Structure formats: structure tokens, C-alpha cells
Amino acid sequence: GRKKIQITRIMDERNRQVTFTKRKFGLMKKAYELSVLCDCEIALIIFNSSNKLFQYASTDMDKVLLKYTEYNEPHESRTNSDIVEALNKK
Amino acid sequence: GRKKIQITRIMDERNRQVTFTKRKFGLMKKAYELSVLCDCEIALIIFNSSNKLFQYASTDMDKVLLKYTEYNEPHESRTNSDIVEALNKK
DNA sequence: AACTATTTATAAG
DNA sequence: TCTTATAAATAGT
């Protein structure tokens, strides 16, 4: 956008609340497209600072969660650190 | 990118596999940033066309899924259709 | 495994 | 492998 930003908690309770809403949609949109382009099933679960729930699922969310729990092989399992680290590599 | 593309299953088994890998990271990156910018907890579950698993979580993924299962209020619960619709509105 | 032709999202071959 | 001014993602070569 107009300015570049440093990933860090927006201290401003409002721009935070606004950015959340905006990006959340972007996130879901992407998820949507990825889901579709590549014939994959996606589930996305979000909890805002106030522990309120927002969820997207390409299909049948609980169906996906169920598959998940039953999975028994190793697999890509990233976390925030994994991500920051992968980033710094570039 | 160089060309605009229509959201639909990449029929080319290869460009599909490639695009999947690329965008998946983009997805996680975003999720990462959202998680951080806005102090929210995020869990992302992906299954490729071949039923293999990929997951990101801002923190303790199972902790998040657990919260989810226990939630009992109505909440934003989007799905692909909800998304396409919302798009066409623009 | 790069590259790269205001940064589509988002902050004020 | 809500409006632009700008950053950040990415299709394709």
C-alpha cells in the first residue's frame, strides 16, 4: 500500500480492527482460489484478539477437521517461526 | 502475473502441482502476517488433490482446533460459494 | 532456481 | 524451479 509496514501488533485498537477485517477477506479469497485452482480441500480457522471465531472451508469444515485428526503420516507442519525463518532466508 | 487467469482446476498436472506449491506458501505467509499484525490465532489445513496434508498454525494448532470445537456462538462461517458470491457483488 | 514485468493487497517461457 | 500511493504477491518466460 501507500506505506510499507513491519509485521507487528498494530497497537492502534482501530487500525488493528480494520486491517483484520480487510486482510481476513484477502486470506479467505486466496484460500478460495487455491482450493479451486488445485483441487484441494482447505479449512481456515481464525480467532481474533477477543476470542471470537471466523472460519472458512472450501467444503465441509467438520469433514476436513475429521480427516486431519485421523492423518497418521508426517507432513508439512509450519508455524510462525518456521515462516519468519524461511523468510529471512531470502 | 504475466497473464491473468480464470479460477478453475489447472488441467495441466504439472502447472497445477507447481502453482499449488507457490500459492500455498503465499497463503501461509499472509496467514502469518495476519496472525501477527492483529494478535489473532490462526489454523490452516490443506489437503492436495492426492489427500496429502499440509498445515500452518500461528501457534499450537491442536489447541486452536480444540477451541474451535468448543465454540458455541454463531460466527462468520464462509465457504467457496459465499466467496464467489461476495466477489460478483463487485 | 531465479527472475521481474504502487506493493493484487493494503496503509494511511 | 471510500479513494490513490505503494508494497507485496505471482504467472510466465
Q: Which CATH number is B52's domain given?
A: 3.40.1810.10
Q: Establish if A5 belongs to a structural domain.
A: no
Residues 13-32 of A with CB under 7 A from strand C: 15, 19, 22-23, 25-27, 29-30
Q: Is residue A36 part of a domain?
A: yes
List C-alpha distances in Å: B59 to B24, B31, B44, B62. Answer: 18, 12, 11, 9
Domain count, chain A: 1
Method: X-ray
From chain B residues 13-72, the ones with a CB under 8 A of any chain A CB are 16, 19-20, 23-24, 26-49, 51-59, 61, 64-65, 67-69, 71
> H helices of B1-90, where?
13-37, 61-70, 80-88
Backbone dihedral angles phi then psi of residue B10, each to the nearest 5 degrees = -60, 115
B55: containing domain:
12-90
The answer to whether residue B5 is domain-embedded is no
Write the burial class of residue A47 (CB in 10 Å: 0-12 exposed, 13-18 middle, 19+ buried). Answer: buried
Contacts of A8 in chain B (CB under 8 A): 36-37
In a domain, B45, yes or no: yes
Residue B74 lies inside a defined structural domain of this protein? yes
A60: in domain: yes
Resolution of the experimentally solved model in angstroms: 2.9
